[PDB]
Amino acid sequence: FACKTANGTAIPIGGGSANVYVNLAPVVNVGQNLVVDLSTQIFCHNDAPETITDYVTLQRGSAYGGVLSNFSGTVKYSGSSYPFPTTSETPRVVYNSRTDKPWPVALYLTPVSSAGGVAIKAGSLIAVLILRQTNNYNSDDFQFVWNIYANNDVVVPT
Amino acid sequence: FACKTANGTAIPIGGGSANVYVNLAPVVNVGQNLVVDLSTQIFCHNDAPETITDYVTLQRGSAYGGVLSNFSGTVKYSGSSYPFPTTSETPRVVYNSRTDKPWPVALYLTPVSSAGGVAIKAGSLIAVLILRQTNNYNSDDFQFVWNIYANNDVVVPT
Ligand SMILES: CCCCCCCO[C@H]1O[C@H](CO)[C@@H](O)[C@H](O)[C@@H]1O
Numbered sequence: 001f002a003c004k005t006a007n008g009t010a011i012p013i014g015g016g017s018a019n020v021y022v023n024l025a026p027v028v029n030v031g032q033n034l035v036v037d038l039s040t041q042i043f044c045h046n047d048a049p050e051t052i053t054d055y056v057t058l059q060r061g062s063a064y065g066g067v068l069s070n071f072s073g074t075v076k077y078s079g080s081s082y083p084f085p086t087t088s089e090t091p092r093v094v095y096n097s098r099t100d101k102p103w104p105v106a107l108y109l110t111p112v113s114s115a116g117g118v119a120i121k122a123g124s125l126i127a128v129l130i131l132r133q134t135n136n137y138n139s140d141d142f143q144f145v146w147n148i149y150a151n152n153d154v155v156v157p158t
Numbered sequence: 159f160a161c162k163t164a165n166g167t168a169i170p171i172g173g174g175s176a177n178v179y180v181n182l183a184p185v186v187n188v189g190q191n192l193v194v195d196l197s198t199q200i201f202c203h204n205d206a207p208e209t210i211t212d213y214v215t216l217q218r219g220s221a222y223g224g225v226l227s228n229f230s231g232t233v234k235y236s237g238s239s240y241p242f243p244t245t246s247e248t249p250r251v252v253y254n255s256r257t258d259k260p261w262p263v264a265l266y267l268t269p270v271s272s273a274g275g276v277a278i279k280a281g282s283l284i285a286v287l288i289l290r291q292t293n294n295y296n297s298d299d300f301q302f303v304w305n306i307y308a309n310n311d312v313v314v315p316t
């Protein structure tokens with residue numbers, strides 16, 4: 001089991017970490033949704049599909065920088081929404097094909113009234129999502145740490 | 159500086175802890191706000207206003223039980239909104255009168271789509287707000303710990 005990103009890098013069998021730079025809407029008002037869709041940027045595949053099945057959860061999702069202080073929100077995972085930053089590990093998604101399937105994660109962030117100005121700075125870490133992978137075959141328990149960075153400035157018009 | 163509640167328990171000079179039971183809207187839809195307004199339930203006053211002016215912030219806000227798991231939200235403090243659970247201490251509100259003035263705190267909670275049924279249980283701890291009071295006179299820095307419980311069940315229609 002391993003994952004890669006859209007045009008970026010990969011994290012191999014065993015787990016590890018990778019950076020993900022995401023394009024964010026450059027202007028968002030108070031009460032509107034910032035949507036960070038990672039199902040268009042993170043993809044994994046099962047490496048022994050005929051004998052092993054891989055179970056994949058979002059173990060922990062964390063907010064940083066401007067997203068931590070100026071936003072409140074949720075994370076949608078395989079069609080279900082949970083509070084973001086996360087307070088518990090999500091239910092598992094099954095990966096059983098050598099073809100790359102998306103990691104079904106999306107953050108839904110809305111700015112707070114006290115936000116004003118550069119709510120998120122470009123190039124800055126905005127979230128870190130952790131993909132935990134297990135299986136039906138052995139003791140293996142692996143974390144793929146995704147560090148999410150902003151490609152652009154986000155502004156909240158005051 | 160001291161505080162009381164509406165049918166009132168009190169936290170005396172020096173700080174301490176108290177319980178607050180709050181009436182909640184029994185039904186809240188996804189996309190709607192559950193509003194917990196403590197400005198109608200928590201009141202404070204200055205004990206030597208002719209010489210001392212007291213500074214009061216919301217130091218920390220923590221979410222519990224069903225609020226922790228099925229809601230995302232913000233906390234409003236003196237006309238500005240911040241993420242709830244909190245990530246930082248708020249700006250200070252000034253107390254300079256022996257008259258009881260409300261603590262200007264309100265929670266604004268919205269249920270997550272994966273929620274359904276009794277999202278908050280009656281009698282359960284749903285938040286803990288910490289009032290920090292200081293002043294311009296001496297070293298005093300006192301904490302008033304507010305434990306917020308639901309008076310009734312809150313249901314999210316699935
Ligand atoms: C049947 C012989 C072993 C065959 C799978 C070898 C590779 O194991 C890696 O790939 C596996 C299959 O995707 C994962 O389930 C496992 O946790 C790890 O990521």
Ligand SMILES: CCCCCCCO[C@H]1O[C@H](CO)[C@@H](O)[C@H](O)[C@@H]1O
Pocket residue numbers: 159160171172203204205206207209210211212292293298300
């Ligand atoms: C003629 C000067 C009288 C001075 C009385 C000071 C009394 O201190 C109490 O009341 C002060 C004013 O509310 C508080 O700042 C302090 O923390 C404590 O609650």
